[PDB]
PDB file of C-alpha atoms in Angstrom:
ATOM      1  CA  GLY A  58    -157.397 145.426-135.491  1.00  0.00           C
ATOM      2  CA  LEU A  59    -158.799 142.283-136.996  1.00  0.00           C
ATOM      3  CA  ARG A  60    -160.901 142.045-133.676  1.00  0.00           C
ATOM      4  CA  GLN A  61    -162.209 145.489-133.944  1.00  0.00           C
ATOM      5  CA  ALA A  62    -163.039 144.769-137.471  1.00  0.00           C
ATOM      6  CA  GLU A  63    -165.335 141.711-136.776  1.00  0.00           C
ATOM      7  CA  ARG A  64    -167.353 143.138-134.319  1.00  0.00           C
ATOM      8  CA  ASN A  65    -167.744 146.207-136.654  1.00  0.00           C
ATOM      9  CA  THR A  66    -168.714 143.810-139.404  1.00  0.00           C
ATOM     10  CA  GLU A  67    -171.144 142.163-136.973  1.00  0.00           C
ATOM     11  CA  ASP A  68    -173.087 145.482-135.977  1.00  0.00           C
ATOM     12  CA  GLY A  69    -173.311 146.461-139.587  1.00  0.00           C
ATOM     13  CA  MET A  70    -174.886 142.971-140.479  1.00  0.00           C
ATOM     14  CA  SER A  71    -177.227 143.769-137.597  1.00  0.00           C
ATOM     15  CA  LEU A  72    -178.147 146.908-139.169  1.00  0.00           C
ATOM     16  CA  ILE A  73    -178.802 145.095-142.473  1.00  0.00           C
ATOM     17  CA  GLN A  74    -180.953 142.699-140.718  1.00  0.00           C
ATOM     18  CA  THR A  75    -182.809 145.557-139.181  1.00  0.00           C
ATOM     19  CA  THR A  76    -183.136 147.093-142.718  1.00  0.00           C
ATOM     20  CA  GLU A  77    -184.938 144.213-144.137  1.00  0.00           C
ATOM     21  CA  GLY A  78    -186.897 143.265-141.378  1.00  0.00           C
ATOM     22  CA  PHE A  79    -188.479 147.087-142.093  1.00  0.00           C
ATOM     23  CA  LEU A  80    -188.984 145.830-145.432  1.00  0.00           C
ATOM     24  CA  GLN A  81    -190.755 142.671-145.166  1.00  0.00           C
ATOM     25  CA  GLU A  82    -194.148 144.122-143.415  1.00  0.00           C
ATOM     26  CA  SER A  83    -193.746 147.046-146.308  1.00  0.00           C
ATOM     27  CA  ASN A  84    -193.900 144.364-148.745  1.00  0.00           C
ATOM     28  CA  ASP A  85    -196.598 142.592-147.195  1.00  0.00           C
ATOM     29  CA  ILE A  86    -198.594 145.734-147.004  1.00  0.00           C
ATOM     30  CA  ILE A  87    -198.188 146.720-150.477  1.00  0.00           C
ATOM     31  CA  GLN A  88    -199.150 143.217-151.780  1.00  0.00           C
ATOM     32  CA  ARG A  89    -202.182 143.782-149.789  1.00  0.00           C
ATOM     33  CA  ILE A  90    -203.043 147.209-151.384  1.00  0.00           C
ATOM     34  CA  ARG A  91    -202.553 145.667-154.519  1.00  0.00           C
ATOM     35  CA  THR A  92    -205.065 142.529-153.722  1.00  0.00           C
ATOM     36  CA  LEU A  93    -207.280 145.090-152.355  1.00  0.00           C
ATOM     37  CA  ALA A  94    -207.037 147.364-155.695  1.00  0.00           C
ATOM     38  CA  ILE A  95    -207.609 144.291-158.104  1.00  0.00           C
ATOM     39  CA  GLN A  96    -210.611 143.446-156.294  1.00  0.00           C
ATOM     40  CA  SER A  97    -211.893 146.835-156.621  1.00  0.00           C
ATOM     41  CA  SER A  98    -211.575 146.421-160.340  1.00  0.00           C
ATOM     42  CA  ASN A  99    -214.772 144.442-160.411  1.00  0.00           C
ATOM     43  CA  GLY A 100    -217.803 146.671-161.962  1.00  0.00           C
ATOM     44  CA  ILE A 101    -220.272 145.401-159.342  1.00  0.00           C
ATOM     45  CA  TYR A 102    -219.250 148.108-156.629  1.00  0.00           C
ATOM     46  CA  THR A 103    -220.615 151.504-156.677  1.00  0.00           C
ATOM     47  CA  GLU A 104    -218.714 154.635-156.072  1.00  0.00           C
ATOM     48  CA  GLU A 105    -219.539 154.874-152.287  1.00  0.00           C
ATOM     49  CA  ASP A 106    -218.111 151.339-151.943  1.00  0.00           C
ATOM     50  CA  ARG A 107    -214.623 152.399-153.808  1.00  0.00           C
ATOM     51  CA  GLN A 108    -214.818 155.207-151.150  1.00  0.00           C
ATOM     52  CA  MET A 109    -215.114 153.118-148.128  1.00  0.00           C
ATOM     53  CA  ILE A 110    -212.497 150.679-149.302  1.00  0.00           C
ATOM     54  CA  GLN A 111    -209.918 153.757-150.206  1.00  0.00           C
ATOM     55  CA  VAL A 112    -210.584 154.873-146.381  1.00  0.00           C
ATOM     56  CA  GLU A 113    -208.420 151.550-145.220  1.00  0.00           C
ATOM     57  CA  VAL A 114    -206.508 152.041-148.380  1.00  0.00           C
ATOM     58  CA  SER A 115    -205.315 155.619-147.229  1.00  0.00           C
ATOM     59  CA  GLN A 116    -205.101 154.032-143.825  1.00  0.00           C
ATOM     60  CA  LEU A 117    -202.394 151.631-145.081  1.00  0.00           C
ATOM     61  CA  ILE A 118    -200.250 154.242-146.856  1.00  0.00           C
ATOM     62  CA  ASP A 119    -200.126 156.440-144.010  1.00  0.00           C
ATOM     63  CA  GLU A 120    -199.459 153.468-141.804  1.00  0.00           C
ATOM     64  CA  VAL A 121    -196.437 153.048-144.405  1.00  0.00           C
ATOM     65  CA  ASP A 122    -195.473 156.601-143.850  1.00  0.00           C
ATOM     66  CA  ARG A 123    -195.517 156.008-140.250  1.00  0.00           C
ATOM     67  CA  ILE A 124    -193.007 153.029-140.449  1.00  0.00           C
ATOM     68  CA  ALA A 125    -190.684 154.846-142.663  1.00  0.00           C
ATOM     69  CA  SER A 126    -190.615 157.853-140.171  1.00  0.00           C
ATOM     70  CA  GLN A 127    -190.124 155.592-137.121  1.00  0.00           C
ATOM     71  CA  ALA A 128    -187.354 153.525-138.582  1.00  0.00           C
ATOM     72  CA  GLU A 129    -184.738 153.260-136.292  1.00  0.00           C
ATOM     73  CA  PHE A 130    -181.331 151.093-135.639  1.00  0.00           C
ATOM     74  CA  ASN A 131    -178.861 153.261-133.632  1.00  0.00           C
ATOM     75  CA  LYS A 132    -181.232 156.234-133.182  1.00  0.00           C
ATOM     76  CA  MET A 133    -180.848 157.071-136.649  1.00  0.00           C
ATOM     77  CA  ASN A 134    -183.362 156.895-139.468  1.00  0.00           C
ATOM     78  CA  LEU A 135    -182.872 154.672-142.424  1.00  0.00           C
ATOM     79  CA  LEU A 136    -185.864 154.322-144.473  1.00  0.00           C
ATOM     80  CA  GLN A 137    -185.946 158.269-145.360  1.00  0.00           C
ATOM     81  CA  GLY A 138    -182.834 157.691-147.344  1.00  0.00           C
ATOM     82  CA  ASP A 139    -180.243 159.781-145.636  1.00  0.00           C
ATOM     83  CA  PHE A 140    -177.872 157.813-147.749  1.00  0.00           C
ATOM     84  CA  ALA A 141    -178.981 157.541-151.005  1.00  0.00           C
ATOM     85  CA  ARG A 142    -177.236 158.187-154.446  1.00  0.00           C
ATOM     86  CA  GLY A 143    -177.603 161.765-153.785  1.00  0.00           C
ATOM     87  CA  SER A 144    -177.182 162.075-150.230  1.00  0.00           C
ATOM     88  CA  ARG A 145    -175.847 165.525-149.001  1.00  0.00           C
ATOM     89  CA  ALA A 146    -176.478 165.331-145.346  1.00  0.00           C
ATOM     90  CA  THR A 147    -174.127 162.440-144.201  1.00  0.00           C
ATOM     91  CA  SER A 148    -172.291 159.275-145.438  1.00  0.00           C
ATOM     92  CA  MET A 149    -172.377 155.888-144.066  1.00  0.00           C
ATOM     93  CA  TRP A 150    -169.049 154.342-143.608  1.00  0.00           C
ATOM     94  CA  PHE A 151    -168.158 150.652-142.499  1.00  0.00           C
ATOM     95  CA  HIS A 152    -164.470 150.524-141.235  1.00  0.00           C
ATOM     96  CA  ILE A 153    -163.819 147.078-142.028  1.00  0.00           C
ATOM     97  CA  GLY A 154    -160.048 146.720-141.794  1.00  0.00           C
ATOM     98  CA  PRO A 155    -157.042 147.478-139.384  1.00  0.00           C
ATOM     99  CA  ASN A 156    -156.046 150.499-140.895  1.00  0.00           C
ATOM    100  CA  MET A 157    -157.881 153.781-141.042  1.00  0.00           C
ATOM    101  CA  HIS A 158    -157.962 153.915-144.848  1.00  0.00           C
ATOM    102  CA  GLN A 159    -159.697 150.720-145.190  1.00  0.00           C
ATOM    103  CA  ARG A 160    -163.229 152.149-145.189  1.00  0.00           C
ATOM    104  CA  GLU A 161    -166.464 150.641-147.067  1.00  0.00           C
ATOM    105  CA  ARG A 162    -169.515 152.517-148.289  1.00  0.00           C
ATOM    106  CA  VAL A 163    -173.137 151.347-147.972  1.00  0.00           C
ATOM    107  CA  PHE A 164    -176.009 153.270-149.424  1.00  0.00           C
ATOM    108  CA  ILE A 165    -179.578 153.206-148.528  1.00  0.00           C
ATOM    109  CA  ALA A 166    -182.301 154.966-150.757  1.00  0.00           C
ATOM    110  CA  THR A 167    -185.549 156.842-149.638  1.00  0.00           C
ATOM    111  CA  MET A 168    -188.673 154.785-148.886  1.00  0.00           C
ATOM    112  CA  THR A 169    -191.121 157.422-148.421  1.00  0.00           C
ATOM    113  CA  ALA A 170    -194.492 157.428-150.122  1.00  0.00           C
ATOM    114  CA  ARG A 171    -193.135 160.000-152.477  1.00  0.00           C
ATOM    115  CA  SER A 172    -190.172 157.689-153.425  1.00  0.00           C
ATOM    116  CA  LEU A 173    -192.774 154.788-153.561  1.00  0.00           C
ATOM    117  CA  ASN A 174    -195.081 157.124-155.711  1.00  0.00           C
ATOM    118  CA  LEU A 175    -197.952 156.390-153.549  1.00  0.00           C
ATOM    119  CA  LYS A 176    -198.583 160.263-153.119  1.00  0.00           C
ATOM    120  CA  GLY A 177    -197.276 163.256-155.257  1.00  0.00           C
ATOM    121  CA  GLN A 178    -195.670 166.656-153.909  1.00  0.00           C
ATOM    122  CA  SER A 179    -198.887 167.863-152.557  1.00  0.00           C
ATOM    123  CA  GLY A 180    -198.948 164.528-150.158  1.00  0.00           C
ATOM    124  CA  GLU A 181    -202.720 163.291-151.516  1.00  0.00           C
ATOM    125  CA  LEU A 182    -202.317 159.506-151.989  1.00  0.00           C
ATOM    126  CA  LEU A 183    -203.206 157.439-155.027  1.00  0.00           C
ATOM    127  CA  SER A 184    -207.167 158.156-155.876  1.00  0.00           C
ATOM    128  CA  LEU A 185    -208.296 154.659-156.680  1.00  0.00           C
ATOM    129  CA  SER A 186    -212.075 155.969-156.296  1.00  0.00           C
ATOM    130  CA  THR A 187    -212.861 154.770-159.834  1.00  0.00           C
ATOM    131  CA  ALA A 188    -212.280 151.811-161.929  1.00  0.00           C
ATOM    132  CA  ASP A 189    -210.905 153.903-164.476  1.00  0.00           C
ATOM    133  CA  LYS A 190    -208.354 155.206-162.122  1.00  0.00           C
ATOM    134  CA  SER A 191    -208.008 151.696-160.725  1.00  0.00           C
ATOM    135  CA  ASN A 192    -205.982 150.624-163.710  1.00  0.00           C
ATOM    136  CA  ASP A 193    -203.721 153.543-162.934  1.00  0.00           C
ATOM    137  CA  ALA A 194    -202.950 152.654-159.562  1.00  0.00           C
ATOM    138  CA  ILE A 195    -201.516 149.230-161.043  1.00  0.00           C
ATOM    139  CA  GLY A 196    -198.585 150.743-162.547  1.00  0.00           C
ATOM    140  CA  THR A 197    -197.724 152.693-159.551  1.00  0.00           C
ATOM    141  CA  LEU A 198    -197.864 149.692-157.298  1.00  0.00           C
ATOM    142  CA  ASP A 199    -195.933 147.458-159.591  1.00  0.00           C
ATOM    143  CA  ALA A 200    -193.055 150.334-159.767  1.00  0.00           C
ATOM    144  CA  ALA A 201    -193.409 150.229-155.835  1.00  0.00           C
ATOM    145  CA  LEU A 202    -192.789 146.620-155.880  1.00  0.00           C
ATOM    146  CA  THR A 203    -189.825 146.684-158.349  1.00  0.00           C
ATOM    147  CA  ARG A 204    -188.192 149.652-156.225  1.00  0.00           C
ATOM    148  CA  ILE A 205    -188.811 147.153-153.114  1.00  0.00           C
ATOM    149  CA  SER A 206    -187.026 144.213-154.822  1.00  0.00           C
ATOM    150  CA  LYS A 207    -184.239 146.420-155.936  1.00  0.00           C
ATOM    151  CA  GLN A 208    -183.866 147.527-152.363  1.00  0.00           C
ATOM    152  CA  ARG A 209    -184.004 143.632-151.025  1.00  0.00           C
ATOM    153  CA  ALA A 210    -181.465 142.694-153.868  1.00  0.00           C
ATOM    154  CA  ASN A 211    -179.166 145.281-152.608  1.00  0.00           C
ATOM    155  CA  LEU A 212    -179.312 144.392-149.040  1.00  0.00           C
ATOM    156  CA  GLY A 213    -179.202 140.855-149.749  1.00  0.00           C
ATOM    157  CA  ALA A 214    -175.651 141.529-151.717  1.00  0.00           C
ATOM    158  CA  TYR A 215    -174.573 143.693-148.696  1.00  0.00           C
ATOM    159  CA  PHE A 216    -175.054 141.044-146.264  1.00  0.00           C
ATOM    160  CA  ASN A 217    -173.565 138.436-148.267  1.00  0.00           C
ATOM    161  CA  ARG A 218    -170.276 140.214-149.009  1.00  0.00           C
ATOM    162  CA  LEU A 219    -169.999 141.328-145.192  1.00  0.00           C
ATOM    163  CA  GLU A 220    -170.365 137.782-143.895  1.00  0.00           C
ATOM    164  CA  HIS A 221    -168.038 136.609-146.100  1.00  0.00           C
ATOM    165  CA  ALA A 222    -165.571 139.231-145.492  1.00  0.00           C
ATOM    166  CA  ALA A 223    -166.296 138.598-141.556  1.00  0.00           C
ATOM    167  CA  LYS A 224    -165.421 135.028-142.127  1.00  0.00           C
ATOM    168  CA  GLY A 225    -162.050 135.982-143.788  1.00  0.00           C
ATOM    169  CA  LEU A 226    -161.349 138.324-140.953  1.00  0.00           C
ATOM    170  CA  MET A 227    -161.991 135.602-138.607  1.00  0.00           C
ATOM    171  CA  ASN A 228    -159.505 133.225-140.324  1.00  0.00           C
ATOM    172  CA  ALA A 229    -157.084 135.882-140.731  1.00  0.00           C
ATOM    173  CA  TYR A 230    -157.328 136.553-136.957  1.00  0.00           C
ATOM    174  CA  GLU A 231    -156.451 132.851-136.076  1.00  0.00           C
ATOM    175  CA  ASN A 232    -153.689 132.490-138.642  1.00  0.00           C
ATOM    176  CA  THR A 233    -152.135 135.701-137.239  1.00  0.00           C
ATOM    177  CA  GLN A 234    -152.567 134.715-133.759  1.00  0.00           C
ATOM    178  CA  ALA A 235    -150.747 131.317-134.667  1.00  0.00           C
ATOM    179  CA  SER A 236    -148.049 133.416-136.324  1.00  0.00           C
ATOM    180  CA  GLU A 237    -147.677 135.391-133.384  1.00  0.00           C
ATOM    181  CA  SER A 238    -147.296 132.182-131.372  1.00  0.00           C
ATOM    182  CA  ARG A 239    -144.807 131.209-133.592  1.00  0.00           C
ATOM    183  CA  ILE A 240    -142.765 134.219-133.081  1.00  0.00           C
ATOM    184  CA  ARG A 241    -143.144 136.017-129.636  1.00  0.00           C
ATOM    185  CA  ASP A 242    -144.395 132.802-127.612  1.00  0.00           C
ATOM    186  CA  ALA A 243    -141.736 130.746-125.746  1.00  0.00           C
ATOM    187  CA  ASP A 244    -142.716 127.099-125.602  1.00  0.00           C
ATOM    188  CA  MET A 245    -141.180 126.190-122.324  1.00  0.00           C
ATOM    189  CA  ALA A 246    -140.115 122.792-123.316  1.00  0.00           C
ATOM    190  CA  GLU A 247    -136.580 123.819-124.213  1.00  0.00           C
ATOM    191  CA  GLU A 248    -136.411 126.654-121.230  1.00  0.00           C
ATOM    192  CA  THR A 249    -136.958 123.972-118.825  1.00  0.00           C
ATOM    193  CA  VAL A 250    -134.018 121.936-119.992  1.00  0.00           C
ATOM    194  CA  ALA A 251    -131.935 125.038-120.304  1.00  0.00           C
ATOM    195  CA  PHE A 252    -133.224 126.099-116.667  1.00  0.00           C
ATOM    196  CA  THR A 253    -131.993 122.560-115.257  1.00  0.00           C
ATOM    197  CA  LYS A 254    -128.520 122.748-116.905  1.00  0.00           C
ATOM    198  CA  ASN A 255    -128.226 126.313-115.769  1.00  0.00           C
ATOM    199  CA  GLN A 256    -129.438 125.222-112.003  1.00  0.00           C
ATOM    200  CA  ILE A 257    -126.975 122.203-111.639  1.00  0.00           C
ATOM    201  CA  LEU A 258    -124.207 124.306-112.900  1.00  0.00           C
ATOM    202  CA  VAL A 259    -124.579 126.830-110.250  1.00  0.00           C
ATOM    203  CA  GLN A 260    -124.180 124.773-107.358  1.00  0.00           C
ATOM    204  CA  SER A 261    -121.419 122.795-109.113  1.00  0.00           C
ATOM    205  CA  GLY A 262    -119.529 125.940-109.507  1.00  0.00           C
ATOM    206  CA  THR A 263    -120.422 126.835-105.887  1.00  0.00           C
ATOM    207  CA  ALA A 264    -118.979 123.336-104.549  1.00  0.00           C
ATOM    208  CA  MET A 265    -116.073 124.144-106.670  1.00  0.00           C
ATOM    209  CA  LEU A 266    -115.275 127.391-104.999  1.00  0.00           C
ATOM    210  CA  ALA A 267    -115.858 125.689-101.304  1.00  0.00           C
ATOM    211  CA  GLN A 268    -113.176 123.268-102.196  1.00  0.00           C
ATOM    212  CA  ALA A 269    -110.992 125.996-103.753  1.00  0.00           C
ATOM    213  CA  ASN A 270    -111.562 128.089-100.665  1.00  0.00           C
ATOM    214  CA  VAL A 271    -109.819 125.730 -98.387  1.00  0.00           C
ATOM    215  CA  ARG A 272    -106.407 125.763-100.228  1.00  0.00           C
ATOM    216  CA  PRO A 273    -104.480 128.559 -98.522  1.00  0.00           C
ATOM    217  CA  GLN A 274    -104.653 126.748 -95.048  1.00  0.00           C
ATOM    218  CA  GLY A 275    -101.885 124.409 -96.350  1.00  0.00           C
ATOM    219  CA  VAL A 276     -98.973 126.918 -96.209  1.00  0.00           C
ATOM    220  CA  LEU A 277    -100.024 127.498 -92.177  1.00  0.00           C
ATOM    221  CA  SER A 278     -98.677 123.968 -91.485  1.00  0.00           C
ATOM    222  CA  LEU A 279     -95.289 125.231 -92.497  1.00  0.00           C
ATOM    223  CA  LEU A 280     -95.294 127.720 -89.713  1.00  0.00           C
TER     224      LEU A 280
ATOM    225  CA  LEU B 226    -193.161 145.713-134.116  1.00  0.00           C
ATOM    226  CA  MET B 227    -192.720 141.669-132.913  1.00  0.00           C
ATOM    227  CA  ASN B 228    -190.397 140.996-136.047  1.00  0.00           C
ATOM    228  CA  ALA B 229    -188.441 144.171-135.067  1.00  0.00           C
ATOM    229  CA  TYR B 230    -188.276 142.972-131.363  1.00  0.00           C
ATOM    230  CA  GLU B 231    -186.728 139.945-132.727  1.00  0.00           C
ATOM    231  CA  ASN B 232    -184.399 141.432-134.839  1.00  0.00           C
ATOM    232  CA  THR B 233    -183.488 143.591-132.404  1.00  0.00           C
ATOM    233  CA  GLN B 234    -182.671 140.799-129.516  1.00  0.00           C
ATOM    234  CA  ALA B 235    -180.582 139.048-132.448  1.00  0.00           C
ATOM    235  CA  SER B 236    -178.493 142.259-132.922  1.00  0.00           C
ATOM    236  CA  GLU B 237    -177.930 142.585-129.288  1.00  0.00           C
ATOM    237  CA  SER B 238    -176.798 138.956-128.778  1.00  0.00           C
ATOM    238  CA  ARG B 239    -173.381 139.825-130.459  1.00  0.00           C
ATOM    239  CA  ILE B 240    -172.564 142.584-128.129  1.00  0.00           C
ATOM    240  CA  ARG B 241    -172.580 141.449-124.683  1.00  0.00           C
ATOM    241  CA  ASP B 242    -173.574 137.832-124.789  1.00  0.00           C
ATOM    242  CA  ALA B 243    -170.550 135.130-124.450  1.00  0.00           C
ATOM    243  CA  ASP B 244    -169.978 132.021-126.730  1.00  0.00           C
ATOM    244  CA  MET B 245    -168.739 129.884-123.840  1.00  0.00           C
ATOM    245  CA  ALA B 246    -165.962 127.944-125.927  1.00  0.00           C
ATOM    246  CA  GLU B 247    -163.878 130.797-126.662  1.00  0.00           C
ATOM    247  CA  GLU B 248    -163.263 131.615-123.164  1.00  0.00           C
ATOM    248  CA  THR B 249    -163.391 128.792-121.393  1.00  0.00           C
ATOM    249  CA  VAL B 250    -160.077 128.089-124.014  1.00  0.00           C
ATOM    250  CA  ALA B 251    -158.649 131.383-122.373  1.00  0.00           C
ATOM    251  CA  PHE B 252    -159.521 130.507-118.591  1.00  0.00           C
ATOM    252  CA  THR B 253    -157.912 127.039-119.196  1.00  0.00           C
ATOM    253  CA  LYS B 254    -154.752 128.657-120.576  1.00  0.00           C
ATOM    254  CA  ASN B 255    -154.797 131.061-117.645  1.00  0.00           C
ATOM    255  CA  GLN B 256    -155.134 128.534-115.192  1.00  0.00           C
ATOM    256  CA  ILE B 257    -152.477 126.539-116.379  1.00  0.00           C
ATOM    257  CA  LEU B 258    -150.162 129.569-116.702  1.00  0.00           C
ATOM    258  CA  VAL B 259    -150.556 130.569-113.132  1.00  0.00           C
ATOM    259  CA  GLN B 260    -150.069 126.976-112.103  1.00  0.00           C
ATOM    260  CA  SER B 261    -146.934 127.132-113.768  1.00  0.00           C
ATOM    261  CA  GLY B 262    -146.156 130.621-112.780  1.00  0.00           C
ATOM    262  CA  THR B 263    -146.620 129.572-109.000  1.00  0.00           C
ATOM    263  CA  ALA B 264    -144.469 126.624-109.487  1.00  0.00           C
ATOM    264  CA  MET B 265    -141.739 128.645-110.967  1.00  0.00           C
ATOM    265  CA  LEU B 266    -142.082 131.238-108.299  1.00  0.00           C
ATOM    266  CA  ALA B 267    -141.735 128.606-105.491  1.00  0.00           C
ATOM    267  CA  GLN B 268    -138.684 126.930-106.993  1.00  0.00           C
ATOM    268  CA  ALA B 269    -136.925 130.175-107.414  1.00  0.00           C
ATOM    269  CA  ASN B 270    -137.426 131.132-103.897  1.00  0.00           C
ATOM    270  CA  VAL B 271    -135.043 128.581-102.842  1.00  0.00           C
ATOM    271  CA  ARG B 272    -132.151 129.969-104.970  1.00  0.00           C
ATOM    272  CA  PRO B 273    -130.001 131.869-102.380  1.00  0.00           C
ATOM    273  CA  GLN B 274    -129.897 129.074 -99.788  1.00  0.00           C
ATOM    274  CA  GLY B 275    -126.815 127.747-101.838  1.00  0.00           C
ATOM    275  CA  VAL B 276    -124.867 131.034-100.698  1.00  0.00           C
ATOM    276  CA  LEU B 277    -124.878 129.729 -97.173  1.00  0.00           C
ATOM    277  CA  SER B 278    -122.976 126.723 -98.392  1.00  0.00           C
ATOM    278  CA  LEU B 279    -120.113 129.099 -98.623  1.00  0.00           C
ATOM    279  CA  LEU B 280    -120.430 130.275 -94.873  1.00  0.00           C
TER     280      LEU B 280
END
């Protein structure tokens, strides 16, 4: 059971690594969008400049959407939040114990542009086409960055507790194997001397039988 | 994608790859086991010749 649990923990932490890898470039692109928007705050750029920068801005958000829709670890999507707080479709479980009841839950939130507030229900992305709306976009990206920080902190705690559990499982594995050796294993160092004692006694007894079997011929001399 | 590739091989490494120490120890244990078992069987084969001493 512990041998099962250790590899289950390993695959879970691999999943966690996949999630944080998917999170890193999203954080990078959000920071890039923030820098571009802050540059757009300058008043020396006319409206067509803001529109043409918004072209690649919209490209960046749709690329983030592509990342979210294409996230995959074990042929299962993760960034769409199938296992959020209010997840109704299904639930994650990490069987990290030798018994069926030892089951641990791990949750992941929705990482879509709607959840990142980059777009509304209609799907239209952040306008940013004017300096007045440029300041408004700052709060949205700050909220997105805070949400990403919360997600990375959650995954950090996840993998830290997971690796501590895996180390504990490995130690319990080795100690339990040592106990099994103490109980069931027969260190042949005593069995060899018992062997030799018995395998000397056997031929001593056979020799005694051999000398005993010659006794009856004595009466024949009386005849 | 390249970061995902790196993480994906990192994940794969713990399914099929081998960490040589924890099976070379098992192989050494099995080798000493087979040597001991062969020796014990060989010395066990000579048991019944003692019966012919009665004959």
